[PDB]
Amino acid sequence: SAHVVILGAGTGGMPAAYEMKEALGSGHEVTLISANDYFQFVPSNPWVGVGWKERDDIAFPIRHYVERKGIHFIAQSAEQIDAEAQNITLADGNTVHYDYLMIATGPKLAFENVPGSDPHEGPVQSICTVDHAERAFAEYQALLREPGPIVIGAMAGASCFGPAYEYAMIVASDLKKRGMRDKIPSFTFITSEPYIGHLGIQGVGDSKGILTKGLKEEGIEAYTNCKVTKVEDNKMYVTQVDEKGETIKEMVLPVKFGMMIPAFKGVPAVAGVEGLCNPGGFVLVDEHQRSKKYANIFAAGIAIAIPPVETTPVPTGAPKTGYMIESMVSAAVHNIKADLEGRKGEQTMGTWNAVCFADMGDRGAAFIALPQLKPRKVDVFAYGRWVHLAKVAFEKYFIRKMKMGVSEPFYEKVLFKMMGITRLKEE
Amino acid sequence: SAHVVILGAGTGGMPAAYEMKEALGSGHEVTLISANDYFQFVPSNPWVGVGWKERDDIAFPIRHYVERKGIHFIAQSAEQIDAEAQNITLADGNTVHYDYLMIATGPKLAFENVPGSDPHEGPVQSICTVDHAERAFAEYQALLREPGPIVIGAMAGASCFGPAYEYAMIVASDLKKRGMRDKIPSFTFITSEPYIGHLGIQGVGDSKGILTKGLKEEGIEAYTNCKVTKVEDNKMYVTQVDEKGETIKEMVLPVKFGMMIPAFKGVPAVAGVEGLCNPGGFVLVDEHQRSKKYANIFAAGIAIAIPPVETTPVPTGAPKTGYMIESMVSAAVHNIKADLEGRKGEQTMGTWNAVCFADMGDRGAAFIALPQLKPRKVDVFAYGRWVHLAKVAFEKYFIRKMKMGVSEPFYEKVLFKMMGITRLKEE
Ligand SMILES: Cc1cc2nc3c(=O)[nH]c(=O)nc-3n(C[C@H](O)[C@H](O)[C@H](O)COP(=O)(O)OP(=O)(O)OC[C@H]3O[C@@H](n4cnc5c(N)ncnc54)[C@H](O)[C@@H]3O)c2cc1C
Ligand SMILES: Cc1cc2nc3c(=O)[nH]c(=O)nc-3n(C[C@H](O)[C@H](O)[C@H](O)COP(=O)(O)OP(=O)(O)OC[C@H]3O[C@@H](n4cnc5c(N)ncnc54)[C@H](O)[C@@H]3O)c2cc1C
Ligand SMILES: [S]
Ligand SMILES: [S]
Ligand SMILES: [S]
Ligand SMILES: [S]
Ligand SMILES: [S]
Ligand SMILES: [S]
């Protein structure tokens, strides 16, 4: 009886392993493979990067929780995927065989697009992982000891803009709480968006007006249509273009403390599978989450390819966010099960949507947009205290579910919990 | 076995009849009694009031639809409820006996609070019912023939403010479309809210700023903290107070075309039941929608009493809106079924919330607030094109459901459809 392997224990993969096991019962092996032995709640990383949260608030060991559900856990990184032989080679030389593979490997952080931009080779840091956010906090503490120019923003090719705004705002806010704000010579915001609050999705509600007003209020100077060409000698080299791509200026910005959201690519093990991915290394799938090249490979989350519906003067991407990811997981689990029972599963991701909550302290911004191209059925950008409460409640709930286990209908619970809630709403 | 009577076939009453008959089956009699033989989708009345919709777009005969579902229908108004004898005396002198009564009679429009304000006795119209909205549109057509001052707003004691803003906005808009906007000598907005966009619920998101801007953009002059003392000789007499209730001015406004949302009271048949209601005639219920005085009378919708959580310089009320209404109905249906089965029903309404969608043409404003007292868990006010699409989709849906019939899970459908949707979102 079919062996199902889930590659990646992240926002998509962990729930996918619980859902797959639940759906398939004790008669089928379900193996979860991940590079780390812990789960981390990614959207809390910006707060870790400013010292508002600690690693152990947002991360926990996976093994016990999945094993108690009958899932076989391997805390090892996949180095190779041989799609013909249907085996995965792990870092220690072991291999895992699968009948169905679900790829949930998320993003490769493509620092190499911008020489010197890697967190280890310069002052420009990053908050996408808890390891890097801890490193960002450390460098932030160094800034506090020897104040200098701050640069925060998002690279060309980035697709996750929200956390750049969140980070800039919470850094400014923390500086003030520390009485250290006026010691900063300059505080610049650099983005590849064609305008503030474009967010990779051509704006949502009054995102432009509200985000613009936030940066202005914090004394942050913002530049759009920018690409960083390199980071060298504690200086960021920026090229800025007009709407038509022609460059209209170059800047050289000194940097004592920096944080740019990198562009995302597919991870190497996945990108290295012949015909599986596009040039960026994202898995080409159909509406059923099935690989177009391999009938027994499915994929969910950031790892999948989603074609642009629009283009920008500086390359930007559209974000892949939680609700939609869980929705992909659900479809993949359903369609794999069907495929086991010798049928073709027809479940889909559903309508493209983006949902993001940014907490700036006691208030935040949240948006929902769908579908991708306008005119939209929902296009809301909201600022207020309630967003802080929602964000906190959802992190609490999601971490709790990752420990207790999850089932098929999870993704729908994910929808009404991000707001807050069906729990508070009284069922 | 027990005969169940639903009194009133509106937003709460119709669903409640379908749900009650489905829940009880063929063994129990379910009777629906309503003043009118037709259903009308109330939120569309303001559009009828400006001629953007016709009666037959938003209303339809009830009889065939509920009978085909096993429900007895009586197109008659209840004149009296005798709660000791458990019968209802109708306009024609017939009586209906019940074992359980569910009261869904909505609002009495309390025009008598303001002498001269009744739509039949003056130029100040109203748009809460489709009859009155039609009469409003007629008066608006008279305005077009002989331009004069416009006054739109909400009386003291009102609880439904959104439609006053909508109507002001759509009248201004239709005026422009007809190239008649500049023939209007003045266009004034008068409200008992302490500030623009208080909406009876202490503001939601940036309701204040957004609505204020809307009135300003339409050349509409707004006054808050107002009460209308009387309407006489085509003049509205207004008293305005300060935060402490001291009057700081009186105005006399000539009115050629007017529309003020009246305060709501409990209907006379219900209010006249000794010990059933508060002084406003709203039914005193517990958290199970059951009357506090009569264990066999339940209530849902506007007809129930909800204590204020705050007070305002001019009396105002908090709105009772669709989603919360459907929650009340469901709990009532469930708890009645329970009673018939020797159990105490424990289902509740849930968390207080308000949800409103105002369509101004190709764009609109919607808000969600919960719970009633701040700090809120959700506090969103959104403006945009998607609001129009959502409004249209939900009306189309609600009307179709009232024709097809409905079941218990309806109220969670009302939630995801008021937005748009689970249908678009794809299941
Ligand atoms: C800073 C930040 C803030 C965000 N905030 C929000 C938000 O507020 N709301 C929202 O809906 N979304 C948010 N997102 C977007 C999104 O939901 C996350 O990026 C999310 O974690 C993506 O889910 P995923 O399962 O696709 O990838 P991940 O969660 O990154 O998981 C991928 C996993 O696969 C593993 N892996 C990779 N390669 C291998 C290999 N070769 N072998 C074995 N394992 C491997 C990883 O180590 C990892 O555990 C945010 C993203 C970032 C970076
Ligand atoms: C102009 C306007 C716009 C609104 N827009 C929204 C919106 O966009 N979103 C939202 O969630 N809510 C909206 N509402 C608020 C609300 O949801 C409605 O008022 C809704 O119709 C109330 O539900 P109900 O069943 O309690 O009362 P109703 O829908 O008014 O039903 C009451 C019914 O009982 C009947 N009746 C009354 N007396 C008797 C009697 N003595 N005997 C027999 N039958 C009787 C009536 O004729 C009627 O059919 C709006 C309200 C108004 C007035
Ligand atoms: S990162
Ligand atoms: S984002
Ligand atoms: S974010
Ligand atoms: S009305
Ligand atoms: S409202
Ligand atoms: S409304």
Curated annotation (Swiss-Prot), chains A, B:
Lineage at the top is: Bacteria, Pseudomonadati, Pseudomonadota, Acidithiobacillia, Acidithiobacillales
- Known role: Catalyzes the oxidation of hydrogen sulfide, with the help of a quinone. Consecutive reaction cycles lead to the accumulation of a polysulfide product on the active site Cys residues; these products are released when they exceed a critical length, typically as cyclooctasulfur.
Family membership noted in the UniProt record: Belongs to the SQRD family.
Q: Which UniProt keywords apply?
A: FAD, Flavoprotein, Membrane, Nucleotide-binding, Oxidoreductase, Quinone
One Gene Ontology cellular component term attached to this UniProt record is: membrane
* InterPro entries assigned to the protein according to its UniProt record, in alphabetical order: FAD/NAD-bd_sf, FAD/NAD-binding_dom, NADH-Q_oxidoreductase
Q: Which domain of life is it from?
A: Bacteria
Note on how the cofactor is bound: Binds 1 FAD per subunit.
Compartments where located: Membrane
Q: Where does FAD bind?
A: G8, A9, G10, T11, G12, S34, A35, S77, A78, I302, G322, K391
> What protein name does the entry list?
Sulfide-quinone reductase
Q: What species is given as this protein's source?
A: Acidithiobacillus ferrooxidans (strain ATCC 23270 / DSM 14882 / CIP 104768 / NCIMB 8455) (Ferrobacillus ferrooxidans (strain ATCC 23270))
Q: Which residues form the active site?
A: C160 (cysteine persulfide intermediate), C356 (cysteine persulfide intermediate)
